[PDB]
Structure 1
Amino acid sequence: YYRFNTGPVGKGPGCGFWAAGWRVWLFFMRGITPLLERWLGNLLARQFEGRHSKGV
């Protein structure tokens, strides 16, 4: 945002260079997909075949 404003350009919005935040929130889901995949698999196990009270 401080490299749009160099020169006679303007202080207002228009900052539309979006790839950098896009890459890191792809890097988030890239590592979190197996994590909450396993978490939702455990959720489906706890919901559909019931819990184990005194098993493990």
Structure 2
Amino acid sequence: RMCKDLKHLIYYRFNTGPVGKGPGCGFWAAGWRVWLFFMRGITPLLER
């Protein structure tokens, strides 16, 4: 849900101006952060 949140955060700043709707936005650092912080927590679970 959080990554979708960040998509809504990023796209609606990305798709302003002459940029319209479309699949061209990639500012991937926010979601990539979120999934790495998930990997931080489940690394010792899957390791155990």
TM-score under structure 2 normalisation?
Answer: 0.69
More helix by share: 2
How many residues are paired up? 38
Q: Which runs of 5+ in 2 are unaligned?
A: 1-10
**Counterpart in 2 of 1:2?**
12
TM-score under structure 1 normalisation?
Answer: 0.61
Cα RMSD, aligned residues only:
0.9
Higher CA-based Rg: 1
Tell which has more relative contact order, 1 or 2 (C-alpha 8 A, sep 6+): 2
- Over the matched positions of the two proteins, sequence identity in percent amounts to 100
What letter is aligned with 2:19? Answer: V
How far apart are residue 3 of structure 1 and its match?
0.8
